[PDB]
Design a protein around this nucleic acid. Structure first.
Ligand code: ADP
Ligand code: MG
Lengths: 788, 754
DNA sequence: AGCTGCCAGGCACCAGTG
DNA sequence: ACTGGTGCTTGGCAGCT
């Protein structure tokens, strides 16, 4: 192998290796003329991933250099293939002029595309958030931060233990996760996508405080409510440094950060989120989830928001009452408002492209279209007497001046890119109309010259055309070419035609080309100038989009409440849940038979229910629908019952029945309070007969007598139906079944008390177990029943 | 695209690829279904590039979709069960076409491997066996009749193909099958009185033929697979034993990942067929045993040679179909060149069956030499552009080539001549399709082009010209190359004519080579992995000394613990108590895997295995309802020659219900069915079973508490267990001390009545 | 509407003359 | 050192059929 010292390198590879050195573990797309190039292992890897040719750049001194590339104009399709696989890519461009550089033109990395910093519409899913996170660990707990680069939403939390951290990763589901190198609990994090090991120094607290204050223009973070939170600040500081390093521009839409405190929301553990099938079902799909039912938002930014609420229920009584109020007030207005809200589109994401100075012409066109909907929205919402609706109406704004600007500046349907022009409209800049008019008293001139020269020469094949490589020409066929004026300067020869130039045409070529380059250069100057006039209003524009997304969510929840027959729940002072004719929101829509509504009464005196009933009798569904009603109540939605009264809930824990069951259970026992809702679904496993049930008993007992949480405790262990007897706060309910001769009917109705019996043998027979075996099993059963 | 509609009507069940430019494009419901299947975008249009079409055919074909291609009319169709091109197939995985049909009596089933010509027919007697045959054979494409009643069997399957009833008519099937095989009746195949089976085989054969529009001379035979010739295993058993596929859908940590170090793709595919179909006939088994023992010493020598043989089976299919490409003939040649050496190595082996495989392997010396002379060392992928036929094979071809090379030589000397005369260092001769041969000169020098040069094309920095002299020799080069290209193709088609008469003997060779690869591998595995030769007894029984689980013992870096087993008619059920934690399950599954391997003819991971006949293996290992439904299947179908492994049934319902079921099953398995059974349980009350009845005994696993953990020992010991560990595992996991203390009190109180 | 092959714009290489 | 020719990815499209 060759000693690759600096001097043994060509000027090209000197520069290239300097720049790859600053990006040693990621693919570097390196601009040379019309191509992005890769070298060495980048080329080999790119070749395998992207399905392009692996070639060689020849070398005078040494071994050939592996090489691959793509034309600059095809870059975004390739960037998409890469980022979809979790690959980052540094984009290196030419800064300088080749004509004034002796050696290689100056080259800089201008951006890095990574899975959690993308903002382009082609690389994202419309209805799903794409978050960058950072995480780190102390001896005591975790700091965690999230950034949605394509809306500027920047958050910080400090999950106190392992399980809260598992729960947070599941909630936020980052596309890319920066973690510190000394991270101990790797089981939380390994086998996630877009994992990015970072050095310790990027989590340093003084640096974080410094960069965040600089980003926000503040002396301190007191006003944001995070000066208190160095654990979280350390993560947020890593995150911000990564974001600035990927974008390499200012980020004026990141103007704020907020701490998500434990107390602010209901904290659902990892099992609970999975078990309720909120946005993801139990097989990874998005069908048959709570979102598949509640989500008929008409804008992308609203679909995202609704899913954020579903996942993070709020404990602020005022916010909830305000949301409920809104939903009752808009019930009659949904049909008129939705088709209009739809037309606003995904303004949030456009505003981020505007902030990053990346917005394309169709973004400004959709921004303009959106502004055009604001008066119709304003008019429709005026009539609605509800202060919260009016507060949104106000916050959404109007932006008359900016709407006018975009109507006058850009044409009706502009092209996808500004690169080829045809974007700025006539009337907006007079210097531009003058340059376009010189390259447009042009198509007409070439025709009159064609006809004039055809008639003058007498040569009827004479045509005038253009060719990018050779320029304008007069063409005569081969058979007539020998008759051409001797004045005609030969320019391009073809198999069956000859092409010429004369000074009149050459002078007209020189004027059309230099005035096209002036028209385009000035279009680009003016289009960048649209950003300068929009940007000052960014703060108010971002508030408008969030208002519009909220509107979309609530208008939606109003239509859902109507169409699906939901009521307004009420909040009470003490823990408790009173449901009348309650229903599983999801199961009631997918079942092709009537859903049996069910009550529930939980209070501080009636705090644990031991639920029995046969397998397939409805014990899990009844538990889940309780949690779903609680969750819907605490995002502000109407709920799928005929009446619900509900007290404060701090946390929802779930255990759905090895070392893992007993560990999850201990978490519940260490961290549940009198304000928690606890769903235990057939827990207690051991290696012998009574082993695991005894544990279940002692656990039920600790939940009832010490923690005093509100617990639904589904079991197959009939012995646990003795607990009410011995234990203040516990009672039996059950799922009713009937045995009419040789079969079982599942009624799906909760009744008070323990069931008459268990039905393990009935269910057994239903499953086809031979009748001779069930006969002996009953005989044995009666032996056991005679014990007492 | 008003013309697209009329071509979609022609085949409305199949996806239509529709050529335009570099792409094939799909519209309406084809585009929708194709974008979710393949990963591509919408517009209703999706499209694929031309240079990768075979890749997207392979992916759609792998998912059960037939595909028609249009170039204007439908010129080619690929169906999932009838492909044979190597780009579309997976090297180490069988691809079957199947037909199924149903009588008032029972089922008819047929399978075909279009590449090998392996054609099978069965008549599964009931619902459960039919389900077992479908999961085992896993056809890529499945023809069924319109009136098929039991749609629950096939509903979920990829590549379903609804078919008219008349395709399953018996007299037509008999007739087409007799014609295909050159026979007057099917007695010589032993299927003459299997009319349900034949109806399935006739529909299948018709469909194959229709998709090929070609004779299928490699399909010369059919066999019938009978119930009693194999150990039956339902899907759940097959899945639990992790034969070819693991529970997560992959190929790792599987029985095949450990046993299948074969060296040819055809041998690997045959080994996997053997693993999934253990046979009851000990005659066949003994021969495989003897061969495995006789080949121990020859293994290091044989395998590097056999690896060079490659996939002769699949290359041969393409010879049968007349689609074999130059590297297929070149690999066939390469395989013929190994036979002398394999013949020499095997001559010494003391084994009638190895000597039979050695005869059947053949030599084909005359075909070896034919392709040595006919084709060059490393021919190009396609015949299309020539350069495949060797120089010296045909005199006429050598002359056209010399005439081309002499005109090509002339034009190189013309280049140097014109370059010397004019004094123009940039002068050169090139060639392309538009201008044929031309003289190029750069733009800076082109103004000194001789006046006899006729300009033809201006480039940005060059001018190309012609002269009469140039066009003259172009004509020599081009006409020569054209005659030699047409001659190469005619000579290539002639190789097929000379090779194909030996097709039958060549399919025997590839098959023998495949078997040898299986056995040479199994012999290397027996010797490498310390396996031993099992013996067979006349009555049911399993006696294992230091048995091991073959996958677990290679996969984990912790000492594997070997265990005995003694099952006989006097001792036919073991009640296995103690912690499970993997140990009971592994012990039970290694029992099944040893039995399965004994019944493949392999050596087995043990110091000693004696084993009686086994008709079925049932392993219900690892909702309550699905657990009870699987138990139901055992109790309805197991016999006194069955092996039954059951993992702690009763869990998921109440203590007394579940204990009553477990008790009553055990009784039934021991007193009525009399299977050989390992009955794993958590119920201590079941350890009283040995006192209450004959042929039942107690064993157990225990654990050792030390330092701050627990070591769950994997050693099976005599007697009931006397410890539970649920509570000890709760303490370790951090369940508060006071909770455990209370659980201990309640445990004692609960167990004390019992 | 298809198929072949020049071109884009960087920089290096290479071979002939200062 | 300086002059003028070459080559290299892929995708667009001219220039021939
Ligand atoms: N209230 C109800 N009305 C109608 N069907 C129900 C109801 N609750 C549950 N089910 C259905 O019955 C089946 C069993 O429900 P499940 O909650 O799993 O019972 P369990 O957990 O007790 O075995 C599921 O298909 C479920 O959809
Ligand atoms: Mg359940």
């Amino acid at each position: 192998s060759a000693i690759e010292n600096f001097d043994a390198h060509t000027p090209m590879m000197q520069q290239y290796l300097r720049l790859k050195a600053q990006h040693p573990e990621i693919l570097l797309f390196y601009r040379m003329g019309d191509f992005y190039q890769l070298f060495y292992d980048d080329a080999k890897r790119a070749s395998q991933l992207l399905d392009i040719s692996l070639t060689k750049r020849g070398a005078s001194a040494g071994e050939p250099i592996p090489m691959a590339g793509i034309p600059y104009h095809a870059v975004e399709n390739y960037l998409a293939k890469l980022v979809n696989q979790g690959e980052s890519v540094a984009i290196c461009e030419q800064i300088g002029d080749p004509a004034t550089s002796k050696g290689p033109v100056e080259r800089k990395v201008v951006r890095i595309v990574t899975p959690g910093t993308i903002s382009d519409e082609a690389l994202l899913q419309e209805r799903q958030d794409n978050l960058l996170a950072a995480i780190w660990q102390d001896s005591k707990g975790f700091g965690y931060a999230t950034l949605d680069i394509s809306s500027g939403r920047f958050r910080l939390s400090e999950p106190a233990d392992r399980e809260t951290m598992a729960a947070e990763l599941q909630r936020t589901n980052p596309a890319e996760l920066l973690y510190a190198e000394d991270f101990a609990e790797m089981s939380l994090i390994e086998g996630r996508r877009g994992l990015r090991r970072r050095p310790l120094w990027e989590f340093e607290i003084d640096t974080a405080r410094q960069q965040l204050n600089l980003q926000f223009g503040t002396r301190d973070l007191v006003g944001f409510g995070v000066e208190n939170a160095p654990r979280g600040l350390c993560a947020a500081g890593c995150l911000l440094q990564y974001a600035k390093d990927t974008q390499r521009t200012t980020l004026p839409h990141i103007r704020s950060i907020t701490m998500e405190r434990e107390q602010d929301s209901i904290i659902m553990d990892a099992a609970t989120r999975r078990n309720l099938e909120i946005t993801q079902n139990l097989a990874g799909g998005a069908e048959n989830t709570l979102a598949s039912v509640l989500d008929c938002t008409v804008t992308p930014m609203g679909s995202r928001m609704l899913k954020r609420w579903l996942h993070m229920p709020v404990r602020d009584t005022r916010v909830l009452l305000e949301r409920q109020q809104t939903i009752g007030a808009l019930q009659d207005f949904t049909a008129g408002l939705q088709p209009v809200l739809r037309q606003v589109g995904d303004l949030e994401r456009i505003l981020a492209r505007l902030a990053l100075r990346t917005a394309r012409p169709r973004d400004l066109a959709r921004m303009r279209h959106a502004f055009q909907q604001l008066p119709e929205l304003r008019a429709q919402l005026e009539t609605v007497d509800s202060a919260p609706v009016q507060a949104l109406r106000e916050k959404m704004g109007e932006f008359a001046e900016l709407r006018d600007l975009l109507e006058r500046a850009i044409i009706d349907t502009p092209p996808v890119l500004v690169r080829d022009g045809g974007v700025i409209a006539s009337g907006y800049n007079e210097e531009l109309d003058e340059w376009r008019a010189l390259a447009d008293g042009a198509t007409d001139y070439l025709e009159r010259l064609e006809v004039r020269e055809r008639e003058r020469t007498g040569l009827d094949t004479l045509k005038v055309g253009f060719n990018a490589v050779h320029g304008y020409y007069i063409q005569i066929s081969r058979g007539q070419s020998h008759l051409a004026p001797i004045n005609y300067m030969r320019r391009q020869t073809l198999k069956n035609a000859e092409r010429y130039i004369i000074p009149e045409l050459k002078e007209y070529e020189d004027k059309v080309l230099t005035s096209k380059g002036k028209a385009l250069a000035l279009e680009k100057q003016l289009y960048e100038e649209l950003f300068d006039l929009l940007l000052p209003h960014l703060e108010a524009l971002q508030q408008s989009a969030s208002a519009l997304a909220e509107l979309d969510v609530l208008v939606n929840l109003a239509e859902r409440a109507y169409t699906l027959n939901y009521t307004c729940p009420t909040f009470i002072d003490k823990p408790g849940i009173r449901i009348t004719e309650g229903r599983h929101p999801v199961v009631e829509q997918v079942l092709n038979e009537p859903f049996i509504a069910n009550p529930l009464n939980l209070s501080p005196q009636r705090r644990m229910l031991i639920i029995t009933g046969p397998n397939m009798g409805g014990k899990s569904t009844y538990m889940r629908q309780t949690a779903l009603i609680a969750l819907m109540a605490y995002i502000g939605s109407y709920v799928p019952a005929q009446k619900v009264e509900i007290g404060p809930i701090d946390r929802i824990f779930t255990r759905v029945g090895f070392m893992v069951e007993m560990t999850e259970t201990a978490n519940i026992l260490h961290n549940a309070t009198e304000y928690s809702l606890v769903l235990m679904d057939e827990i207690g496993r051991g290696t012998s007969t009574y082993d695991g049930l005894s544990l279940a008993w002692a656990c039920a007992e600790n939940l009832a007598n010490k923690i005093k949480a509100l617990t639904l405790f589904a079991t197959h262990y009939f012995e646990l139906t003795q607990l009410p007897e011995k234990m203040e706060g516990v009672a039996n309910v059950h799922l009713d079944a009937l045995e009419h001769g040789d079969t079982i009917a599942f009624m799906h109705s909760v009744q008070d008390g323990a069931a008459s019996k268990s039905y393990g043998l009935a269910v057994a027979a239903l499953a086809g177990v031979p009748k001779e075996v069930i006969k002996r099993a009953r005989q044995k059963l009666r032996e056991l029943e005679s014990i007492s």
